């Protein structure tokens, strides 16, 4: 039961650690978005990034 | 009865040594509250800590 209980307190710190990390209200991490995208040319066309849900 | 006594003296120091253990005005091995909640975001999400009562 000890090990057990360890092992639902780190879940909860992944968890935590996973959803409090945002840059802007924006991440890459949390699943928040399926991707996102950022500008690579004059003209709009976006420099495509696959999220990963962590 | 000497080891009667000397069991109700180490009772009255577990008690006197659970009660003298607070930090700041807080505490959570006497069982003072039920929890405390620190922070862990700054939304104002909480860490949470159950108390012991020891």
Tied chains: 1, 2.
Excluded at 5 to 13: I, K, P, T, V
Excluded at 20 to 46: C, I
Aim: without cysteine; proline residues 0%.
């Amino acid at each position: 039961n000890a090990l057990k209980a360890d092992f639902e307190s780190l879940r909860d710190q992944l968890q935590k650690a996973a959803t409090n990390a945002k840059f802007n209200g924006v991440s890459l991490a949390d699943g928040s978005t399926t991707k996102l995208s950022f500008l690579a040319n004059e003209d709009g066309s976006n420099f495509t990034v696959t999220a990963q849900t962590l």
